[PDB]
Design a protein around this nucleic acid. Structure first.
Ligand SMILES: [Mg+2]
Ligand SMILES: [Mg+2]
Ligand SMILES: [Mg+2]
Ligand SMILES: [Mg+2]
Lengths: 83, 160, 49, 55, 120, 177, 41, 86
RNA sequence: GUAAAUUUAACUGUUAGUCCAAAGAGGAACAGCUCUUUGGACACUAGGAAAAAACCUUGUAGAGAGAGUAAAAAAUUUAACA
């Protein structure tokens, strides 16, 4: 009955060794979210605009100001995509 | 009535962490073997899907899978297009289980095959050693050898 | 890999943590009695030669 | 083909409609969508973990 | 001023308490000292750095063997505080000619003649 | 996984709203756990370049307590800029004027001194009382536990615990008390 | 046939994710009736 | 980490020093053929080989020095008998 | 136990030296003070002590998105009386 961690949020975990004791194996099927643990489904100018979207996105006003042409040209237009 | 070493309930009477007790070893041995054999027939029946693997090679680890590229900072003296079987694996794992070693897994358990595809001279890495107000400066450019491997496929054996 | 394993399979890293936590209780059981007891099942070591 | 998953090249319309159609071929009931977890609902970055349950 | 420090020989006389601790039996004493460097050669007198070089331990974490005799004892005594010392003991007899290549060292000072590289 | 590219990447680097009750907690320990959660160190995918920080909400910042006489010993000093503008205020006086203050400048020291500091600071939220607007109260995720246990008072200790606890000594009857 | 330049990383994985990539809600439980903290209904 | 624990059992404090983590071959042919030894493994074996040849040289010299004294003492006891016999 | 040493042939440059530890001298048993002797560092890289020349770890150089270690984080609260 003893368990090392609560097996109720991520996966039902159990460890196991071969009888010789040279390799360790694990069995961790993911938990099933019960139905009880769910819910039913159902202009302006620079000053006012930069602060209201900052209050909307929860960030500062600095990054929203426009940068110079020096940085706009240095931005890469064909960046490499992974996968 | 009370043991001599007994103490009433306080904050420092017992440690803050909760007391625990480990299970008995005999039923654990039957639990160690039972959970292994159901995993053994699981892989024999083929319930698993992908299987990733960790590898010790060239004095450093990598997490790898099948159909994935990998680079090494030296030459192995292998012709391009040749296949090789890697010996060392720290662990391999599927969607619902994992096979960890002590430290590595057995030879007969796994068969990790990988093909060599490509070999570059590394891009020119420049180095400059400089010291101030003493006219000590120097340059050097290195192009170390590199090789590109790819793990074609990984498989596991029923032996366990 | 220990970090990268936690990125993509937390279920695996949970087994590593569960494996690690069990060794602590085995080590604390060894702290109570060093010898004169059956050693930990996971604390058992492999001897190379 | 290893790189791109199914719905990258094979785009589809009304996926849940196609889902309920396929589930009737497989002889099971009509599932219901239920938000399991939520974060930032009133925030401009809403986030919902919707799960489809049948029976 | 600072000079070479002569050590009393009485300090290097093992008592029965020390014998039971390190398990070194006085009779049947070992022959060879496994030597390894830990402390840096720098910030030491000229006589301390050249001796360890004369012993051949400029490299750290490099086990190197010396004799257990009073002559070489004086050398690594004055620079004893730069190195580790561990005795040599082996169960498998001296290394035979056939097993010259398959040798292997251990952290416990052992030197196994045979090394087949897999567990029991 | 079997998740699409953009939705999976969105859920990984998404933000979450923590909640904490400051009743009988020290401002340091709640600041220690908060600061690591503000950069996103708790995320295994942490990277300082990627602003993967998460919001934090504190309640009952008025009902905080120090360990020691730091209500009197500790001093919070600042300088306006003018001559004589250097002033000092005890933690008690600073608490009477602003109960939101003690934590906000306490976390301010914990997190690093970068330009991401002020972004993470405003992301954090504070309230002296347990009354919250429905907007910021609805977008919640999880309430992490408190660092320290709160000791119970004599009126709180039930009778069966006192009876279980054994009396220790005999009082002589000849005593006024 | 590709230009020798710096490589962003020394390997490439086409299917790096097994068992589901980590999101914040992997390692925490759910709530009875699906309730946020300090919520009646 | 764990260096003090590894040397407790006799293992290397650094696992890269010796043991199966490095001494085994790091690659082999797909057909099961054995790969050639690595440069690190070759110089390590040559180091241990000269180390073994050195230790055998050190031991036999000490044994030759010990017996050479006792052979001199037997000669010493011999000539003392010669003195009283004369 | 080690491999350097003496001599020969031909030159160059250093010959304006600060600090630490110790034995001393002058001075105030003053100086980041001055003058000698033994040793070390610095005027050669790197890590730590906050930034640090001289303190503490560490030398023979490279690639690595490998690993194990070295030195390495200040502790203190004080006074009753027939
Ligand atoms: Mg001076
Ligand atoms: Mg001076
Ligand atoms: Mg001067
Ligand atoms: Mg080196």
């Amino acid at each position: 009955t003893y368990s090392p961690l609560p097996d109720d949020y991520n996966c039902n975990v159990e460890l196991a060794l071969t009888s010789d004791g040279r390799t360790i194996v694990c069995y961790h099927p993911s938990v099933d979210i019960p139905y009880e643990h769910t819910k039913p489904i159902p202009h302006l100018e620079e000053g006012p605009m930069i602060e209201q979207l900052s209050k909307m996105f929860f960030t500062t006003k600095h990054r929203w100001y426009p940068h110079g042409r020096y940085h706009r040209c240095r931005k890469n237009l064909n960046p490499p995509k992974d996968r | 009535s009370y043991l001599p070493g007994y103490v009433p309930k306080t904050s420092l009477s017992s440690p803050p962490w909760p007391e625990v007790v480990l299970p008995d070893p005999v039923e654990e041995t039957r639990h160690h073997a039972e959970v292994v054999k159901k995993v053994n027939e699981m892989i024999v029946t083929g319930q698993y899907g992908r299987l990733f693997a960790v590898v010790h090679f060239a004095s450093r680890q990598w997490k790898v899978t099948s159909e994935d590229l990998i680079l090494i900072g030296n030459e192995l003296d292998l012709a391009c297009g040749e296949r090789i079987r890697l010996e060392k694996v720290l662990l391999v794992g599927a969607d619902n289980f994992t096979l960890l070693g002590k430290p590595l897994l057995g030879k007969d358990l796994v068969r990790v095959e990988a093909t060599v595809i490509e070999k570059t001279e590394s891009w020119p890495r420049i180095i400059m050693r400089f010291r101030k107000r003493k006219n000590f400066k120097k340059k050097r450019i290195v192009t170390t050898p590199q090789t590109v491997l790819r793990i074609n496929s990984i498989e596991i054996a029923p032996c366990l | 890999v220990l970090a990268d394993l936690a990125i993509y399979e937390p279920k695996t890293f949970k087994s590593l943590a569960a494996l690690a936590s069990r060794r602590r209780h085995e080590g604390f059981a060894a702290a109570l009695g060093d010898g004169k007891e059956p050693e930990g099942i996971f604390s058992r070591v492999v001897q190379y030669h | 083909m290893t790189g791109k998953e199914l719905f990258e090249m094979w785009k589809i319309i009304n996926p849940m409609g196609l889902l309920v159609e396929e589930l009737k071929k497989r002889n099971v009931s009509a599932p219901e969508s239920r938000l399991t977890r939520q974060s930032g609902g009133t925030t401009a970055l809403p986030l919902y973990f919707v799960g489809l349950y049948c029976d | 001023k600072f000079t070479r420090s002569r050590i009393p020989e009485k300090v290097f006389q093992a008592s029965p308490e020390d014998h039971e601790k390190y398990g070194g039996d006085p009779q049947n004493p070992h022959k060879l000292h496994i030597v390894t460097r830990i402390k840096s050669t720098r910030r030491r007198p000229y006589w301390e750095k050249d001796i360890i070089k004369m012993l051949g331990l400029e490299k750290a974490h490099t086990p190197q063997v010396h004799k257990n005799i009073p002559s070489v004892n004086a050398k690594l005594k004055v620079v004893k505080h730069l190195i580790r010392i561990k005795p040599l003991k082996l169960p498998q007899g001296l290394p035979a000619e056939e097993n010259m290549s398959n040798t292997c060292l251990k952290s416990t000072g052992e030197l196994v003649v045979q090394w087949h590289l897999k567990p029991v | 996984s079997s998740f699409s590219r953009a939705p999976q990447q969105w859920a990984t680097f998404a933000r979450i709203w923590y909640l904490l009750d400051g009743k009988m907690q020290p401002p340091g320990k709640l600041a220690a756990m908060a600061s690591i959660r503000l950069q996103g160190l708790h995320k295994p995918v942490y990277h300082a370049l990627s602003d993967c920080g998460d919001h934090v909400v504190i309640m009952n910042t008025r009902h905080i307590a120090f360990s020691g006489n730091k209500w009197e010993q500790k001093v919070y000093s600042s300088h306006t800029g003018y001559p004589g503008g250097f002033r000092q205020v005890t933690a008690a006086q600073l608490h009477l004027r602003d109960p939101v203050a003690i934590v906000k400048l306490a976390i301010y020291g914990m997190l690093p001194k970068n330009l991401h500091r002020r972004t993470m600071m405003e992301r954090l939220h504070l309230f002296p009382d347990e009354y919250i607007p429905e907007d910021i109260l609805k977008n919640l995720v999880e309430e992490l536990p408190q660092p320290r246990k709160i000791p119970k008072r004599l009126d709180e200790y039930t009778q069966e615990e006192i009876d279980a606890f054994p009396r220790l000594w005999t009082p002589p009857e000849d005593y006024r008390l | 046939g590709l230009d020798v330049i710096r490589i962003r990383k020394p390997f490439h994985t086409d299917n790096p994710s097994i068992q589901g990539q980590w999101h914040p809600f992997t390692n925490k439980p759910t709530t009875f009736r699906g309730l946020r903290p300090r919520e009646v209904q | 980490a764990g260096g003090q624990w590894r040397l407790q059992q006799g293992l290397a404090a650094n696992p890269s020093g010796y043991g199966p983590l490095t001494e085994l071959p790091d690659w082999s042919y797909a057909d099961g053929r054995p790969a050639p030894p690595m440069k690190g493994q070759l110089r390590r074996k040559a180091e241990r080989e000269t180390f073994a040849r050195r230790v055998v040289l050190l031991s036999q010299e000490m044994d030759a020095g010990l017996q050479a004294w006792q052979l001199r003492q037997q000669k010493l006891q011999e000539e003392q008998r010669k003195q009283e016999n004369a």
